[PDB]
Symmetry: D2
Subunit: 33 residues, 4 copies
């Protein structure tokens, strides 16, 4: 129903959040050394 469209979209956004964290970690590595 609407709930499972919601679950698909929330899972996609969780994946996007993981990507954001990874990219911020690489920017930290560039800022340090």
């Amino acid at each position: 129903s609407g709930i499972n469209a919601s679950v698909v979209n929330i899972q996609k956004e969780i994946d996007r959040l993981n990507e954001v964290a990874k990219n911020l970690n690489e920017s930290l590595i560039d800022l340090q050394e």
Copy 2:
């Protein structure tokens, strides 16, 4: 100073991605309610 430049660009792109996440979660709320 080039690494600081690259950090500024990358952090801005990630801010844009966070805004995208927030907006998609908002219409996920619309799909959950009705």
Copy 3:
């Protein structure tokens, strides 16, 4: 309905947290640009 509301409130709370993260990252960005 009750549980739907519980999911809705929790996701809204996480949206507010994400907006806060965006604001703080923008402030660190402004500090990086003036340096």
Copy 4:
């Protein structure tokens, strides 16, 4: 350079916040599937 060190600390704090958000959204996903 102290501003760079402070930027590193603060961005790490926000990365931790983002991971916590991901965990809470996974918990809401588990509740939505039931």
